[PDB]
Design an enzyme around this catalytic site. Sequence first.
Site, PDB file in Angstrom:
ATOM      1  N   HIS A   1       0.853  -1.217   0.000  1.00  0.00           N
ATOM      2  CA  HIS A   1       0.000   0.000   0.000  1.00  0.00           C
ATOM      3  C   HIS A   1       0.880   1.256   0.000  1.00  0.00           C
ATOM      4  CE1 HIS A   1      -0.442  -0.171   4.664  1.00  0.00           C
ATOM      5  NE2 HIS A   1       0.345   0.849   4.340  1.00  0.00           N
TER       6      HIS A   1
ATOM      7  N   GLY B   1       2.701   6.426   9.354  1.00  0.00           N
ATOM      8  CA  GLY B   1       4.154   6.299   9.191  1.00  0.00           C
ATOM      9  C   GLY B   1       4.694   5.029   9.819  1.00  0.00           C
TER      10      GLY B   1
ATOM     11  N   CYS C   1       3.531   1.834   9.496  1.00  0.00           N
ATOM     12  CA  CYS C   1       3.333   0.644   8.628  1.00  0.00           C
ATOM     13  C   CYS C   1       4.708   0.161   8.150  1.00  0.00           C
ATOM     14  CB  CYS C   1       2.402   0.934   7.457  1.00  0.00           C
ATOM     15  SG  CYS C   1       0.673   1.019   7.981  1.00  0.00           S
TER      16      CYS C   1
HETATM   17  C1  LIG Z   1       0.502   2.730   8.569  1.00  0.00           C
HETATM   18  C2  LIG Z   1       1.263   3.724   7.726  1.00  0.00           C
HETATM   19  O1  LIG Z   1       2.400   4.040   8.052  1.00  0.00           O
HETATM   20  N1  LIG Z   1       0.665   4.235   6.626  1.00  0.00           N
HETATM   21  C3  LIG Z   1      -0.726   4.108   6.218  1.00  0.00           C
HETATM   22  C4  LIG Z   1      -1.429   5.436   6.386  1.00  0.00           C
HETATM   23  N2  LIG Z   1      -0.641   6.606   5.949  1.00  0.00           N
HETATM   24  C5  LIG Z   1      -1.262   7.830   5.754  1.00  0.00           C
HETATM   25  C6  LIG Z   1      -0.547   9.017   5.921  1.00  0.00           C
HETATM   26  C7  LIG Z   1      -1.150  10.247   5.748  1.00  0.00           C
HETATM   27  C8  LIG Z   1      -2.496  10.319   5.413  1.00  0.00           C
HETATM   28  O2  LIG Z   1      -3.123  11.524   5.235  1.00  0.00           O
HETATM   29  C9  LIG Z   1      -2.612  12.657   5.933  1.00  0.00           C
HETATM   30  C10 LIG Z   1      -3.227   9.151   5.252  1.00  0.00           C
HETATM   31  C11 LIG Z   1      -2.617   7.921   5.425  1.00  0.00           C
HETATM   32  C12 LIG Z   1       0.826   6.515   5.823  1.00  0.00           C
HETATM   33  C13 LIG Z   1       1.360   5.106   5.691  1.00  0.00           C
END
Ligand SMILES: *CC(=O)N1CCN(c2ccc(OC)cc2)CC1
Lengths: 304, 304
Positions: free
Chosen positions: A41, A143, A145
Amino acid sequence: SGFRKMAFPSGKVEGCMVQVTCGTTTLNGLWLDDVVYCPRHVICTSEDMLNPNYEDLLIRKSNHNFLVQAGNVQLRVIGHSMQNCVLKLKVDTANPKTPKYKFVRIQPGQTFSVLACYNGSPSGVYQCAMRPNFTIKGSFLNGSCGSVGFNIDYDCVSFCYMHHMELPTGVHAGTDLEGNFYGPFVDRQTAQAAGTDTTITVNVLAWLYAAVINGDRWFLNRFTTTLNDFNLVAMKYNYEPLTQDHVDILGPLSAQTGIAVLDMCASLKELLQNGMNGRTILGSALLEDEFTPFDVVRQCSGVT
Amino acid sequence: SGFRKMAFPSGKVEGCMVQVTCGTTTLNGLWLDDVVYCPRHVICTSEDMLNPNYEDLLIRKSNHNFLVQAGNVQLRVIGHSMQNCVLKLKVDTANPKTPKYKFVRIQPGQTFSVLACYNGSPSGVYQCAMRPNFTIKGSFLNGSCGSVGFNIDYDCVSFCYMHHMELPTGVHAGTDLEGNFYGPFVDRQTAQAAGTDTTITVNVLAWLYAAVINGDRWFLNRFTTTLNDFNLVAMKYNYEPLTQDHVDILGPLSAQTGIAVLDMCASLKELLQNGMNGRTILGSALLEDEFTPFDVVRQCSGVT
Ligand SMILES: *CC(=O)N1CCN(c2ccc(OC)cc2)CC1
Ligand SMILES: *CC(=O)N1CCN(c2ccc(OC)cc2)CC1
């Protein structure tokens, strides 16, 4: 004496954590030999995440689109492939800090350490269990993940988990390092609800043994039970059925304490039926189920 | 989301742990620059431990009596001195893995990570607090003495604790890295009892803020209180007096959640008076007091 929720020392895993960026998304990768492992993802726009076609999204990505940084040094990506829900980024440099490692798929009730990371940098280490509903109860912000879960056997790190997803109820879903989700979870922003979070009975018993070893004995009683009788009570309280295999696994703790497994079951039965009455066991007011019998013997004996 | 009892990543400290043997006693040392730090009781026969005269016992020890081993390689001891209750063994080799470090003496209520070690080898990492009675609630078997407690500020390890002693009640006593015991404890096998293990009020409040941030809100109520009113209830329940300094420290969490500190005090007051009624907060059935306000902001924001 004393008994603590204890993670493995994280140094060997710290040595493997890198930053992966694809477009505007930064998360963590695991660098072992000349391969960086990360959640697929990383290629999605939050927009894509509603109904991503990963094969189709991946066609638009080249090696030079995956920005992989180990500390302040960039790694050169010379190949990328999708395996299930992880990407494998082939880099031109073997991680010099690669430990002895295995990829293992754990069963529900097994515990592991998580090294929570942000932008490839370690923030903390905590102990988790694979829940019977194939979630984990973690601590993961945006961040985080690509953070991984692991056990250590002396010098060999067994990687069992990579973080992918938070469910609307604040529990966590992820994959093994072959990219197969634990449980029915998918890397899509959709209606996924966790099933019953049942209590890991064999782990609770292990922790009651830990309590007795460490001087907490008030819950020992004059009763015994049978697996069938105990399991009627387990059923009623959303505990996992206790099997003879579980009884066999608790044998060494039984032997060390001289408390028959079925006597400790009768103690647990009374605690379920009567509650704690405002008392604690090993500083907990609930029955702890994220210590395995192996964990209790490890911590009580002092393995390194 | 999610909130876990989280230790610092241990790699920087793993790199500092050595084995120290004197006669028949093996425990852990901390190797920073060309100095190995260890508990002075390494020189005692369990016999000596009843009423040791350390200056007198140390006269019988030479540099070649302190066997210091980093992994499988011996270190050459070129000097030894006693500072308070630690020995400083000068070795001929600077630890090449020495991180940026400080020695700090923490106050009661401050948290830290412990790297539990046996024979210079890391077994696990867990989070502790200096208790108001200057004990810690650890996990320490024979061989674990010289294990250290630490905080990390980005790249600088602040060492705050070295393990020395278990009290007959199974709680732990130790020193800072200048060898001064926390609290009234001594490195002698004698009648030492811990005082009241009071609850760290400011930490409980921080953790209630963490709970609200992470979706656990059932304990929020329509009440407020004053510091004086709350402190009458704190007194009754063996909680530390809340000071304006504590209120000031909780300001950022107040701001982020929009819950006035004194409103969260009134929530805590009701929980103290009424109990949990079989409910949980962040998966705990008791009020957790080993997260500092700094810990909650760190974990909720994702610092590395
Ligand atoms: C779990 C992880 O590190 N991630 C999934 C969600 N993600 C994300 C970052 C920023 C936004 O909008 C501000 C939505 C999702 C980053 C990667
Ligand atoms: C805490 C620690 O590592 N130490 C203090 C106690 N200790 C010890 C070992 C063996 C015996 O008798 C079998 C007594 C005390 C080792 C060092």
